[PDB]
């Protein structure tokens, strides 16, 4: 299960945050700052995997805004990257040419999509079209 997911920009600003572990607000902020510093202080050939606090911190940013995850040391490492890619593809399909500008303004939509896709740190829908259809149906409810 993913302990936490933090979508941070290249400049260090965070556009998304979703932690599945109940932590203090100050502790959560410190952890986010440390993760941003570690990711921002890493090269492009670091394997996209960091063992921070005994957590397989996987970073894979496909644009200026980066992505982060906190997977426990009990599952495969490529699974987190595959899940991140699937989530990015689903968000792009739901939004349509998703960019950094739409993420900040449409943070509620991204949060709803993440909730409908991953709940409690585990995957909820393996397919990419069923989740999109469910999100569209929920949005069309009003």
């Amino acid at each position: 299960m993913i302990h936490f997911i933090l979508l941070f920009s290249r400049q260090g600003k965070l556009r998304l945050q979703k932690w599945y572990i109940t932590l203090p607000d100050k502790e959560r902020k410190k952890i986010t700052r440390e993760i941003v510093q570690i990711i921002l202080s890493r090269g492009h050939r670091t394997s996209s995997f960091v063992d921070w606090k005994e957590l397989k911190l996987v970073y894979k940013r496909y644009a200026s805004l980066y992505f982060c995850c906190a997977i426990e040391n009990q599952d495969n490492e490529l699974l987190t990257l595959e899940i991140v890619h699937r989530y990015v593809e689903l968000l792009d399909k739901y939004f349509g040419n998703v960019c950094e500008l739409d993420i900040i303004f449409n943070f509620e939509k991204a949060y709803f999509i993440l909730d409908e896709f991953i709940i409690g740190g585990e995957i909820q829908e393996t397919s990419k079209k069923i989740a999109v259809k469910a999100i569209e149906d929920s949005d069309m409810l009003q």
Binding site: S9, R10, Y62, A63, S64, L65, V88, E89, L91, D92, N97, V98, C99, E100, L101
Partner: peptide, 10 residues
């Protein structure tokens, strides 16, 4: 800018 670019460009 660098923000208007698509995350995956699909």
């Amino acid at each position: 800018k660098g923000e208007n670019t698509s995350l995956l460009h699909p």
